[PDB]
Amino acid sequence: QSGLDVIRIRKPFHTDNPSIQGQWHPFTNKRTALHGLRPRELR
Amino acid sequence: YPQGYVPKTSLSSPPWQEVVLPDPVEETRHHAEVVKRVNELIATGQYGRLFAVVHFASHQWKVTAEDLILIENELDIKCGERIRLEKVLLVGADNFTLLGKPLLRKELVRVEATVIEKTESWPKINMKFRKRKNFRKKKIIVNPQTILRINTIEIAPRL
Amino acid sequence: IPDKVFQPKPEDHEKYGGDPQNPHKLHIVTRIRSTKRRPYWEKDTIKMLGLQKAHSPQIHKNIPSVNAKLKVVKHLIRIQPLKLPQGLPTEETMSSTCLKSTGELVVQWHLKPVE
Amino acid sequence: TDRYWRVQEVLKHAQHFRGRKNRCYRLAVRAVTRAFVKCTKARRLKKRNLRTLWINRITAASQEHGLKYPAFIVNLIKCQVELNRKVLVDLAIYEPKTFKSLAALAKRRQQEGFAAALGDGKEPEGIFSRV
Amino acid sequence: SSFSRAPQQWATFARMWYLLDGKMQPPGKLAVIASNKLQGLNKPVYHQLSDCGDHVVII
Amino acid sequence: TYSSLPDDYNCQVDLALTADGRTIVCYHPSVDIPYEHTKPIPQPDEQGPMIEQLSKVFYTTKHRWYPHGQYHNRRKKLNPPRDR
Amino acid sequence: WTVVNPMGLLVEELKKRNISAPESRLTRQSGSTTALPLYFVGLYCDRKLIAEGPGETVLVAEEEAARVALRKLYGFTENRRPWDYSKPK
RNA sequence: GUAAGUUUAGAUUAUAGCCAAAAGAGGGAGCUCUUCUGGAACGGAAAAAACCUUUAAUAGUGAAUAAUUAACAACA
C-alpha cells in the first residue's frame, strides 16, 4: 500500500494529455463560404 | 415513353438516394497507394502523441503515454514491474489511425505498462430494503484494487 | 395439436436441414423462461432435466423417454441437434473441444480466426 | 456502560442532518438507516444511467457528422468493431479527426451494406465489406 | 489543438444563434427540431448541468 | 471520391486496407480554410433593477441572483477538488 | 515560460526566418452584438493560415492565435511526441 | 431421468389465510356457493401485496437479451 488516502475516487482515469487531435468545438465541421460571408449578408 | 415508365413524383421516387461505388480494380490501387504513403509515414516517424485502445478485464481503456489506470482487483504482480498489454484493437496518430480486424497483429504493436500500487476500494455500504430493517443488516465491501502506469507504446512499419 | 407435428415430412426436413434417415442422436436444450407461476408438473420436469439456470446448454439423448420429457417442457426450451463434424473427441483431444452456436462440437480448437 | 458511544455511532452519521432529527436519537437512527439504504439502491441504477449518458453523447456526436446512432452502430458491428460506448464518447471529444474517419468508415460500409442488401449476395463483397 | 485552456473552454461552451423560417411549415416538426436546438442536444458533449442551450430565431 | 463522407470541413479522410487485409488504414490530414473564404479582421476600431440587468445580460432568471441564508452559505465546500 | 507581447515576438521570429508577417483574418464569428461574443482570428501568411485562435474579442483571438503560433514555432504542439522516461540508457 | 425411501423410537410445530385465473353447481343479469391452478421484483402493465418478464447475491465508469399503450365517411 501507498501513503495515498483510501476514499472514494470520482474517476478511475488520470491523464495529463486528454486530447491529441484537438478538442471539439461547435465551429468544427462547419464549412466556410467565399469571402467568409456571414448568413443573410446581401453584400 | 418506354415500357414500364413511371414519371417521377412524390411517391414514384424513394426518399433515399442511390449511390454508385467505384470500380473494384482501381479501388484496390487507391487502397494500396494509400497504404504505401502511410507506410512511409510510419517509417519516417511523422507522429507525436498517440492513443491506443486496449481491452483489459471487461473494460476497454483508451490509453496514452503516462496514463494511470486502476483495476478493481489484485493482479499478483510486484509494484514497479513492467507488464505488456496484449489486447489492442486501435492505435491512433495525429494524421492517421490503424484499426484491428478485430485486433492488430502482435508484431505491429507492443504496449508496456508498470504496476504502481496494490490497494482495496473505499468501503461500499450494502443494505437491502425490508420491513423492520434493523440497524445491523448492512455490509461493507472494500473490493481489492491495483494501479497501473503506462510506460511506452512501440510500433513499426510492418504493414 | 396434430401428432403430425412430431412426424416429420420431406418439406420440414428441407426447411430445417435434417435428413429423414440417420436421425440425430443428441438434443441441445436451453431454458428460455421462468418456471415461476407455472404448474407443478412443469416445474418438476424442468428440475429433472437440470435446466435450473436459463440460457444454460444441456445435452440430452434423442430417445423416446427423453423425447416425452422434452415434449412436456417444449414451450420453455429451444431444441437443437448436436453435430460432430470431426467425430467424437479422443482422450488426447478432450482438452481441445469447443461447442459452436451452430450446434457443432469441434474436437480441435486452434484459436485462429476463421475470417 | 457504552450506551453513550452507541448513540455517538448514530450521531456521527447524523451530525450533518438538519432539524430535531440530528439531535434526537429516535429520529436520528431512522434517518441514518434511510440514508444508507438509498445509496444501496442507487448503485445498481447508477451503472445504467452512465450507459444512457454515453449513448446519448454518441448520438449527438454522430448527428453532428450527420450519422444516426443506430446506423453507425450496425455498420461498426458489420465491420467487427468492438469499441465500447464509453470509449466512443472519448474518441469524438478528443479525436474529432478520428471520429470523422470512423464516420466515413461507417458510411462507406453503410453504402456497401445497402449495395450488398440490394445485390442479395450475388455481387462480390465490397472491399470494405470483405472479411 | 494547442489552444490555451481558458479560450478552449470558452469556444466549446459557447452558444450559437440559429434562424428558422416557418412559412408553410408544420410547427410541430419545427418544434421537435427547435427543442433539440434549444435544449442543446445538438452538441456532442451535451450534459444536463452544462446549460449548453442555443439561441433559436423563428420567423 | 473514395471517401464516403465530405472531406472539406474537418480533414481529408483516405480509407485503405493493408496488404494482409486484417487492418484498415485511415489518413486524416487537417484542412485549412481558404483565404478567399474568410473575412478580414474588422479594420475599423438599484437592487431591483440590478437583478433585472443581471438577468437580461445572461438570459437567466431573477430568482438566481437573490441571496441565500447563512445555513446554506456555511455548508458550501471551501476546497473544490482539482487534480492537475 | 513567460512571454509578453506575443504578436511582436511572433513577428520578430518571422523576420528572422525571412517569413512574411501573417495577415489577420476573421475566420468565424458568433454572437457579435451580444454580451457573450465569440471571435475566431486566423493568422494568414502569404494568404495561408498558420495559426488560429478563439477569443471573446478580435484582439483576444489575435493574441490567442499568436500564442498558438509561438508553440508551433518552437515545436510545442499539443500533439507533439511525448518525452520518454522509460529509456534505461 | 434421477436420490432418496421403508420401518422403529422420541418430540414438538401446525390445526384461522389473501387475491387472481380455471372447472362445476344453484341462476336466467350478475350475483351464491364448491373444486383445481398460481402468486408475494430489485423490470413492466401509470399509481397496481395477488397479472406479465424474472433461479440466489458480490464489486466493476463492461456486454447480449426478457417483459415492457399503443392502433393505423361507405358505393356497388
Q: How far apart are CA C115 and CA A3, in angstroms?
A: 50
3 state SS of E56: strand
How big, in percent rounded to 5, are the helix, strand and coil portions of chain G? 30, 25, 45
Cell of B53: 485502445
- Which E residues in the span 1-59 are in contact with D, Cβ-Cβ below 8 Å? 41-46
Beta strands E55-58 and F14-17 are: unpaired
- Taking the Cβ of residue A39 and every Cβ of chain E, the question of whether any pair is shorter than 8 Å is answered with yes
| Residue F30 DSSP symbol | B
N-to-C CA span, chain C = 44
Q: How far apart are CA B118 and CA B78, in angstroms?
A: 9
Residue holding cell 504493436? Answer: B109
| Residue E42 DSSP symbol | T
Full strand arrangement of the beta sheet holding G38-45? F39-40, G23-30, G38-45, G48-55
Residue holding cell 428440475? Answer: C47
CB neighbours of residue C100 within 10 Å: 10
Nearest neighbour of G82 by CB, restricted to B65, B94, B112: B65
Residue holding cell 433515399? Answer: B16
3 state SS of A14: strand
CB contact under 8 A, A29 and D94: no
Q: How far apart are CA F56 and CA F54, in angstroms?
A: 6
Q: Which helix (H) or strand (E) holds G15?
A: helix G6-16
Cell of B66: 503516462
Residue holding cell 461447442? Answer: C99
Cell of C89: 473427441
Q: How far apart are CA B39 and CA F16, in angstroms?
A: 12
Residue holding cell 507506410? Answer: B39
- How far does B135 lie from chain D, in Å, by closest CA? 7
- How far does F84 lie from chain A, in Å, by closest CA? 7
Q: With contact defined as beta carbons under 8 Å apart, do B118 and B75 qualify?
A: yes
Nearest neighbour of B95 by CB, restricted to F18, F24, F28: F28
At residue A11's C-alpha, the angle toward residues A10 and A16, to 5°, is 130
Q: Which residues on chain G are in Cβ contact (under 8 Å) with A24?
A: none
Q: How far apart are CA E21 and CA E31, in angstroms?
A: 12
> Quick check: D38 CB within 7 A of strand H?
no
Nearest neighbour of D95 by CB, restricted to B27, B92, B128: B92
Do you find a cis peptide bond into B102, omega within 30 degrees of 0? yes
> Quick check: A3 CB within 7 A of strand H?
no
Beta-bridge partner residues of C83: C104
Nearest CA in chain D to A28: D96
Q: Which residues on chain G are in Cβ contact (under 8 Å) with E4?
A: 53, 64, 67-68
Beta-bridge partner residues of G48: G45
The torsion defined by the Cα of F50, F53, F57 and F61, in degrees rounded to 10, comes to 80
Q: How many residues does chain C have?
A: 115
Beta strands B96-100 and F23-27 are: antiparallel
N-to-C CA span, chain F = 44
Which residues, 6+ apart, have CB-to-CB distance to F39 below 8 Å? A35, A36, A37, A38, G25, G26, G29
Which residues, 6+ apart, have CB-to-CB distance to C44 below 8 Å? none
Q: Which helix (H) or strand (E) holds F28?
A: none
Beta strands B144-155 and C58-61 are: unpaired
Provide the residue type at G43 as one letter.
L
Nearest CA in chain B to A11: B70
DSSP, residue by residue, chain D: --HHHHHHHHHHHHTT--GGGGT-HHHHHHHHHHHHHHHHHHHHHHHHHHHHHHHHHHHHHHHHTT--HHHHHHHHHHTT----HHHHHHHHHH-HHHHHHHHHHHHHHHHHHHHHHHHTT-SPPPTTT--
CB neighbours of residue F53 within 10 Å: 12
Q: With contact defined as beta carbons under 8 Å apart, do B113 and B153 qualify?
A: no
CB contact under 8 A, A32 and F84: no
Q: With contact defined as beta carbons under 8 Å apart, do B156 and B105 qualify?
A: no
The nt closest to C60 (CA vs C1′) is: H1
The torsion defined by the Cα of B149, B110, A22 and D76, in degrees rounded to 10, comes to -110
Q: D50-55 long-range CB contacts below 8 Å, 24 or more apart?
A: D50/D86, D51/D85, D54/D85, D54/D86, D54/D88, D54/D89, D55/D85
Q: Which helix (H) or strand (E) holds B109?
A: strand B109-120
Q: Which helix (H) or strand (E) holds G24?
A: strand G23-30
| Residue F4 DSSP symbol | S
CB neighbours of residue D98 within 10 Å: 24
Q: With contact defined as beta carbons under 8 Å apart, do B41 and B95 qualify?
A: yes
- Taking phi first (over 0 means left), then psi (-120 to 50 degrees means alpha), and beta for anything else, what does residue D120 get? left
Q: How far apart are CA B140 and CA B30, in angstroms?
A: 60
3 state SS of F11: strand
Beta-bridge partner residues of C30: C78
Beta-bridge partner residues of G39: G29, G55
Beta-bridge partner residues of E58: E20
> Quick check: B129 CB within 7 A of strand H?
yes
What is the SS3 assignment for B50-104? CEEEEEECCEEEEECCCCEEEECCCCCCCCCCEEEECCEEEEECCCEEEEECCCC
Beta-bridge partner residues of C60: C27
DSSP, residue by residue, F36-84: GGSEEP-----HHHHHHHHHHHHT--HHHHS---HHHHHHS-SS-----
Q: How far apart are CA C57 and CA D103, in angstroms?
A: 39
Nearest neighbour of A38 by CB, restricted to G29, G40, G78: G29
> Quick check: D51 CB within 7 A of strand H?
yes
Cell of C12: 420440414
- Which D residues in the span 15-44 are in contact with F, Cβ-Cβ below 8 Å? 18
- Taking CA atoms, D72 is separated from B81, C82, C83, E22, in Å, by 40, 36, 36, 31
Q: How far apart are CA D57 and CA E47, in angstroms?
A: 8
Cα within 13 Å of Cα(G5), Cβ side: 5
CB neighbours of residue E16 within 10 Å: 18
Q: How many residues does chain G have?
A: 89
> Quick check: B125 CB within 7 A of strand H?
no
Q: Which helix (H) or strand (E) holds G26?
A: strand G23-30
Q: Which residues on chain F are in Cβ contact (under 8 Å) with G49?
A: 32-33, 35
Q: Which among E12, A40, B23, A32 has a CA at the least distance from the CA of G54?
A: E12
CB neighbours of residue G53 within 10 Å: 27
CB contact under 8 A, G31 and E2: no
Q: How far apart are CA D69 and CA D63, in angstroms?
A: 7
CB contact under 8 A, G79 and B94: yes
Q: What is the greatest pairwise CA distance in chain F?
A: 75
Beta strands B88-92 and F14-17 are: unpaired
- How far does A8 lie from chain D, in Å, by closest CA? 14
**Interchain contact C/A (3 or more Cβ pairs less than 8 Å):** no
Q: Which among E42, F3, F25, B34 has a CA at the least distance from the CA of D106?
A: F3
Provide the residue type at A29 as one letter.
N
Q: Which residues on chain F are in Cβ contact (under 8 Å) with D105?
A: 4, 15, 24, 26
3 state SS of E8: helix
Beta-bridge partner residues of D11: none
- Taking CA atoms, A1 is separated from B67, B117, B121, B150, G67, in Å, by 20, 6, 12, 19, 43
CB contact under 8 A, B55 and D82: yes
Q: Which among E43, B92, E8 has a CA at the least distance from the CA of F24?
A: B92
What is the SS3 assignment for chain C? CCHHHHCCCHHHHHHHCCCCCCCCCEEEEEECCCCCCCCHHHHHHHHHHCCCCECCCEEEECCHHHHHHHHHCHHHEEEEECECCCCCCCCHHHHHCEECCCCEEECCCCCCCCC
Cell of B54: 486496449
Cell of A40: 443573410
Q: With contact defined as beta carbons under 8 Å apart, do C93 and C112 qualify?
A: no
CB contact under 8 A, D83 and B90: yes
Method: cryo-EM
G6-16 and G58-73 are packed helices; what angle lies between their axes, rounded to 10 degrees? 40
Which residues, 6+ apart, have CB-to-CB distance to D23 below 8 Å? none
Nearest neighbour of B34 by CB, restricted to F20, F21, F27: F27
| Residue A36 DSSP symbol | G
CB contact under 8 A, G78 and E2: yes
Look up the protein residue whose alpha carbon has the minimum distance to the C1' of H43. Answer: D45
- Taking CA atoms, C30 is separated from C39, C52, C67, C73, G23, in Å, by 19, 10, 15, 11, 72
Cell of C111: 484459436
Q: How far apart are CA D101 and CA F3, in angstroms?
A: 9
The dihedral through the CA atoms of F61, F62, F64, F65 has a sign that is positive
CB contact under 8 A, G26 and F38: yes
Chain H bases closer than 7 A to any CB of the protein: 1-2, 37-40, 42, 51-55, 58-63
Q: Which helix (H) or strand (E) holds E55?
A: strand E55-58
Residue D114, Cα to own-chain centre: how many angstroms?
Answer: 29
Q: How far apart are CA B97 and CA B92, in angstroms?
A: 4
Chain C residues 22 to 41 whose Cβ lies within 7 Å of strand H are 31-34, 36-40
- Taking the Cβ of residue B51 and every Cβ of chain D, the question of whether any pair is shorter than 8 Å is answered with yes
Chains near E with 3+ CB pairs less than 8 A apart are: A, D, G
